[PDB]
Design a protein around this ligand. Structure first.
Ligand SMILES: c1nc2c(NC3CCCCC3)nc(Nc3ccc(N4CCOCC4)cc3)nc2[nH]1
Length: 264
């Protein structure tokens, strides 16, 4: 039966959607019984660099929403030396949970979601952000439209009440080779669309974690692309999962691709 105040306005808490490390997100109602999601971040043990990172996420998100409506709407925020309250729009469900429940995705809906994702990541790229660690969980379904909730800075968020994929599965090869590019996100997006298309991520079948990394980077490992009705889609997946960034398709190319632009 808890409640919370953000910028002079009081919000009753219905339940906790999920928590990741030093942050929590709640389903809340306002004064006029309108629904929102409020993110609470605890800064008490957050280091100087970590504070600066959270500052950046708010700053960008605050600006970016004015450009595109495929980035989560932040209606209001409150920020102090010990806490952050972010009042965002409420979404029905994160994509990762939705994808776990949907054993088969509708080809039309997949295609729509893909266009929603592309528009979102295109917008962050245009403002000089490479998300780098892109996941399905970074996308939120609000009224049949995917929206980008998280910019990948210092996130550990899971829902808080089977778990097939690992953390590494969507990661680019260059990031593993690193020990950079907008096209690094294109690889990650590619894996999301690949999961939606074939039911698993490209390297899910690999048992061992050590070798799974080595498998991603290795050019002599070939990825499966079983034939499907949409020969467009099959091209997009291949084009996204080409290991070399220079050859790998760019976001603007993906937008003018037939899959996105051609009606069937
Ligand atoms: C801004 N930020 C938001 C969310 N963040 C969540 C943070 C934890 C991981 C999932 C996303 N969830 C939102 N909605 C959800 C509603 C129900 C959800 N669940 C239903 C399925 O089982 C898991 C919880 C998950 C997210 N809305 C939202 N607006």
């Amino acid at each position: 039966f808890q409640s919370m105040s953000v910028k002079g306005r009081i919000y009753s808490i219905l339940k906790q959607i999920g928590s990741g490390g030093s942050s929590k997100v709640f389903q809340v109602l306002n004064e006029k019984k309108q629904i929102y999601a409020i993110k609470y971040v605890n800064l008490e043990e957050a280091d100087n660099q970590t504070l600066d990172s959270y500052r950046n996420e708010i700053a960008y998100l605050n600006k970016l929403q004015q450009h595109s409506d495929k980035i989560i709407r932040l209606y209001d925020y409150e920020i102090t030396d010990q806490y952050i309250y972010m009042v965002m729009e409420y979404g029905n469900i994160d994509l990762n949970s939705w994808l776990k429940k949907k054993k088969s995705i509708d080809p039309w809906e997949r295609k729509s979601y893909w266009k929603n994702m592309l528009e979102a990541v295109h917008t962050i790229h245009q403002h000089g952000i490479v998300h780098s660690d892109l996941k399905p969980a970074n996308f939120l379904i609000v009224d049949g439209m995917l929206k980008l909730i998280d910019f990948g800075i210092a996130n550990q968020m899971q829902p808080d009440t089977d778990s097939q994929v690992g953390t590494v599965n969507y990661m680019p090869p260059e990031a593993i080779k690193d020990m950079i590019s907008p096209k690094s996100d294109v690889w990650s997006l590619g894996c999301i669309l690949y999961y939606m298309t074939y039911g698993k991520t490209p390297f899910q079948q690999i048992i061992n974690q050590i070798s799974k990394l080595h498998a991603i980077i290795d050019p002599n490992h070939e990825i499966e692309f079983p034939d499907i009705p949409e020969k467009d889609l099959q091209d997009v997946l291949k084009c996204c999962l080409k290991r070399d960034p220079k050859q790998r398709i760019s976001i603007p190319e993906l937008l003018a691709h037939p899959y996105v632009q051609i009606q069937t």
